[PDB]
Structure formats: C-alpha cells, structure tokens
Design a protein around this ligand. Structure first.
Ligand SMILES: CNC(=O)c1cc(Oc2ccc(NC(=O)Nc3ccc(Cl)c(C(F)(F)F)c3)cc2)ccn1
Lengths: 321, 266
C-alpha cells in the first residue's frame, strides 16, 4: 500500500464499524435489518441497509448525496453512513418505521380506513413530496410500500417517505405517459402515483390493479376501464408520445364509453360531490400538464373541511396493526 | 438541478465553509517541508491536473469543479503525505462524475485518462507513468467519502453568476470573462472560505473592471457585505500576479520532490 502508514492505522483505530455499534443478529426484515444499539443507552429501534454491490454505484452515490442534504419531517432521515473498508460495503442507518402503507391497507382490506387518517396520510405524503419537488428531487417510484409510518414514540403516526428500491414488478402506480413511452421522469408522474395512493386509501383496493418495453397494454386498458378513454381535448399532446400509434392500433374509444372516475368511485361508496373526490380527480388527470401540483393540492379545501389533518395520522384512535 | 436553492441549510454551508485560521493551523504540518509560496504553487498545479483530467474525459465544468472541491477538502484536513495527490486527483474526478449524474467512468477509461494526461500535459513533473490501478482508486474513494462525511453535493459560483449577468443584461459582454475568472478562483482557498454567490460577485466585479464597464450602481443596490466581496477581489487580483510570477513547468519537479511522502510500514 502506498498510503501513509500512520494515517492508515490511526483511521482504522478510530473508525466506527456497524458490527460494533449494532446488534442485527437475524431480524432481516440489498438487505434491510432491524437493529438495536449494543451500547444500551438507547431503546429505540433502527433499520440498517447494506447497499447491494461492492463500493459505491451511481444510484448509491446519489442516494447518499441526496439523503445527506434532505431534511423534512415526512422524508426518512439518514442517521449515519458506515463504510466497511475490509469488504468495501456501505451501510445506511435510519430510525425504524414500525408501519408501512402496504400493510396498513392490506389490514383494512382484510378486516373489511378511518377518514381522518386517510386525509392525514395524504397531507403528509404531499408535504414530503412538495419539499422534494421544491428541491428538484423526483421520487420516481411512489407506492404504498414506500410510504412508511412511525409507531409509538416521539414521532407517532408521522409519515416517512422512503425509496427502498432506488437502485433498480408492479405498474399500478405508473402514469400513462410513461406507459406510452415518455422519456423523462417528471413531478407530474409523482403526482399521479399520489393520486393512485389516495384512491386506494379511500377504497382499500388499488385503483389500477392489473395482472402481471415501456408500452404495457393491459395496464393502459385497466386505466381506461376506470378513467374512460381520453378525448383529444383532454390530452392534446398525447399524439407526441412515442407509443401513440401503438395505442391507436390496439385501442378503440368505444370500448370505454360507459367508463369514468365518477362511475368507478361511485361503486366504491365514495361520493362524487365530496371534496375528497374533487381533489382525487385533479390528481388523476391523464394529461400531465393538467395535473395539480403538490403545493396546489395542499391548498385544496379538502384539507380545511372537518376533520383537519393531524401530525399523528393515528390521532383520535389506537393502532391495531 | 437537485438541491438548488438549499445552500443555507446544506452540508456545504453548515460543515464545509471553513475558518481560515483553522485551515492554516492544519496546514502548518506541511509547511515544515514546503514554504507558503511552494504550497500555493502546488495547489495551482493540482487544480490544473484535475482540469486536464476533466477535459480529457469531456466532463462539464461543474463536475470538474466538484472534483476540485473534494480534493481541497481532503488536504484541508490531512497532510499531502497521507495519500498521494496523484492518486487522489483522479479519484476525485471519478466520484464527482458519479455524484453529478454524468456517469461511472469505466475502469479502463479512468486509468487510461490519468495515464495519458500525466504523460502528455505533465511530463515535466512526472517522468514515470501513472503507477496506479483501479483497486487503488476504489480504496482511495472510500477514504475520500469518509473524510468528507459523505457530504457530496457542492455548490459553485457559476449558477449565481449566470443569474447576476442576466439581471445586468450583459450576458454577451461579461459572461465569458467572469466565468473564466470563476474557474481561476479554484487555484486558491476561496471555495473553502466563502459562499459561492460572493465569489460570483467578486469575479463579476473584476470582469467589469477589466472590460471598463460601469456597474457601480448595480453593485451598490445589493444587500451583501461588500467588505467580504473586497477580500475576495484582493485574492483574485493577487492570483493573477502569482500566475505571472510562477513558471509551473520549470518549478514543479523540484517542488514535488519537497512534498512530504508517505511513511512505509515499519
Ligand atoms: C417496516 N419498516 C421498514 O420496512 C423500514 C425500512 C427501512 O429501510 C429503508 C431502506 C432504505 C431507504 N432508503 C431510501 O429511502 N433512500 C432514498 C433515496 C432517494 C430518495 Cl429521493 C429518497 C427520498 F427522498 F425519496 F425519500 C430516499 C429507506 C428506508 C427503514 C425503516 N423502516
């Protein structure tokens, strides 16, 4: 080794190692572990993620670079990065989020979601994404599994947006422009996913649920069965999409004539004249330039209507999950 | 671009705007081997090496700038003997390229670029060929990340400069010169001591003086401490006199021989 000896040995003597500070024997919930401090002067649960691959890949660099700078109550906090020099592995440390929205929804789909909780989930997701968007950071993979929620403790019921598959399949939350071959991720694509999540919170079922390169026929079909087929006035630049020709070849407007978001939400007991529905409709707009922004959505009168959103999404209730 | 407008709560601002006295105190270790003059010559030299590496790899100026800041941060804390700067330079370019979302320079392309650049542009200083391989880059990368405490997003004066000249309505007259002066500030400690916007203002002022443009009124109606700007202007004015007096190609072999070198295992 050509590096200074005294420099090397000093750093190795002082270097924090994950295996010294944390007990993660099993608890394998790359790979993510539930961890406890070995020191004992700490009873809080932590999550440890070992980055997949050796060293630091593009996505890994980016995840670290962004999380290091990002600071908002509804975006998961990076507490620490451990650099394992012998095996060149990277570890990320976070506070453990007891719950996530995929298990929360599954629980309610199985027992069958309180309305106060739905609103507060939506508000906090929007808050977090608004912060990301204002800093020109796009999530690009919003879905219930990526919406964490803190359990008992000082952050009870606080949403934490995560991106647990940042390195890299369900298309239920993908905006139609991506299914028609759009080449760039956008803020609007995130907003469409949020709309999908909101609908799912309101009904307990994924609104664009579909059986398992960018063109995905069955997924678009499911979107049209729910939304109807867009008129040219609804999405004027749909004809600029790379797969537009394919769409014309595969689909006919007439197939979806009796379909609309109003009719879909009606058979799931959600009222079309509700402030909830009108917000949802502004989020699930087919044309991405006609979608509401995250900030516009936070200002919606839905959030001024009784009941107000709460910082603890479980507020006024107990946690059965 | 990511985290634009977040400077005041950024890791750059909160952890990596250093105190000058702290900086010079840590530098005293190396100043037992090199005079102060030789130290600022060495800095000019490695700035140029990193710029050459960047140009060869066809990286945008912002990536080169980020790489240059990584290099400065490392040696702001540690002695030149800790890790060979010839190894650290290309390691910084490699990490910055990944962080700035330009790409992962391939193994063979990174090593080929360092080998070629040292041989073609710097043979006066390096008669032997670049001796390092990718395993050394990867080991160095880990030491670099550790030292920087994973603080990877770096702000630079180019963006604010762009906004300032657009406001003046002097994009075509003053931008090329002021941008070039910004590049030259990386030959100094300025990026460790001042927010980028201040450096932008200092560079623009110097550009105005050089091109005989009256912009007094414009500068007068800014809400910034002009004392700080004037400190920055004096360093810029000085760097051109230093540039004039420094013959890099004649001096660097001797200066590099004076650098403290890594102690071997005992
Ligand atoms: C039941 N409980 C758990 O499953 C659980 C799992 C945990 O594991 C995690 C593992 C990795 C991550 N990594 C990110 O999230 N990286 C990220 C990258 C870019 C960007 Cl942009 C973002 C941002 F900003 F979008 F948030 C986030 C987060 C959580 C932690 C706590 N609890």
């Amino acid at each position: 080794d050509k590096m200074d000896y005294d420099f090397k040995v000093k750093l190795s003597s002082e270097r924090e190692r994950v295996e010294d500070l944390f007990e993660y024997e099993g608890c394998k919930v790359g790979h993510v572990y539930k961890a406890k401090r070995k020191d004992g002067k700490d009873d809080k649960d932590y999550a440890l993620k070992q980055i997949e691959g050796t060293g630091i890949s593009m996505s890994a660099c980016r995840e670290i670079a962004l999380l290091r700078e990002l600071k908002h109550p509804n975006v998961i906090s990076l507490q620490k990065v451990f650099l394992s020099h012998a095996d060149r592995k990277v570890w990320l440390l976070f506070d453990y989020a007891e719950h996530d929205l995929w298990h929360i929804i599954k629980f309610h789909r199985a027992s069958k979601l309180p309305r106060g909780m739905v609103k507060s989930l939506l508000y906090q997701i929007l808050d977090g994404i608004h912060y990301l968007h204002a800093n020109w950071v796009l999530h690009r993979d919003l879905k219930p599994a990526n919406i964490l929620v803190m359990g008992e403790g000082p952050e009870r019921g606080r949403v934490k947006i995560a991106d647990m598959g940042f390195a890299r399949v369900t298309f239920w939350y993908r905006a139609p422009e991506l299914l028609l071959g759009a080449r760039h991720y956008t803020k609007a694509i995130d907003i469409w996913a949020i709309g999908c999540i909101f609908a799912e919170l309101l009904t307990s079922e994924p609104i664009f649920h579909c059986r398992q390169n960018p063109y995905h026929h069955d997924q678009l079909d499911r979107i049209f069965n729910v939304m109807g087929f867009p008129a040219d006035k609804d999405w004027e630049d749909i004809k600029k999409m790379p797969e537009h020709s394919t769409l014309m070849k595969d689909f006919r407007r007439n197939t979806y004539t009796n379909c609309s978001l109003i009719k879909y939400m009606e058979k799931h007991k959600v009222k079309p004249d509700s402030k909830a529905f009108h917000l949802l409709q502004k989020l699930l707009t087919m044309d991405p330039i006609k979608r509401i922004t995250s900030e516009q959505a936070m200002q919606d009168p839905y959030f001024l209507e009784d009941p107000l959103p709460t910082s603890d999404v479980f507020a006024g209730c107990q946690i059965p999950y | 671009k990511a985290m634009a407008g977040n400077f005041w709560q950024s890791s750059h601002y909160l952890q990596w705007i250093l105190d000058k006295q702290d900086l010079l105190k840590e530098r005293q270790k190396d100043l037992k081997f090199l005079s102060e003059e030789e130290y600022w010559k060495l800095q000019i030299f490695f700035t140029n090496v990193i710029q050459a590496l960047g140009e060869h790899l066809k990286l945008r100026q912002q990536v080169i700038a980020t790489a240059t800041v990584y290099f400065k941060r490392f040696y702001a804390r540690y002695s030149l003997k800790s890790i060979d700067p010839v190894l650290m330079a290309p390691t910084c370019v490699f990490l910055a390229s990944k962080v700035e979302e330009f790409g992962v320079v391939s193994n063979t392309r990174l090593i080929a670029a360092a080998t070629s650049v040292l041989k073609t542009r710097f043979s006066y200083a390096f008669p032997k060929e670049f001796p390092y391989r990718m395993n050394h880059i990867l080991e160095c990368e880990f030491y670099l990340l550790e030292l920087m405490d994973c603080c990877l997003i770096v702000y630079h004066p180019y963006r604010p400069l762009l906004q300032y000249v657009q406001d003046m309505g002097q994009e075509d007259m003053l931008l090329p010169l002021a941008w070039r002066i910004v590049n030259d500030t990386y030959r100094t400690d300025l990026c460790l001591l001042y927010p980028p916007f201040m450096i932008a203002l200092a560079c623009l002022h110097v550009a105005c003086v050089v091109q005989q443009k009256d912009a007094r009124q414009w500068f007068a109606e800014l809400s910034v401490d002009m004392e700080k700007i004037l400190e920055i202007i004096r360093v810029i004015l000085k760097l051109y006199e230093q540039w004039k007096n420094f013959d890099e190609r004649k001096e660097m072999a001797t200066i590099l021989s004076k650098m403290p070198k890594p102690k071997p295992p005992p």
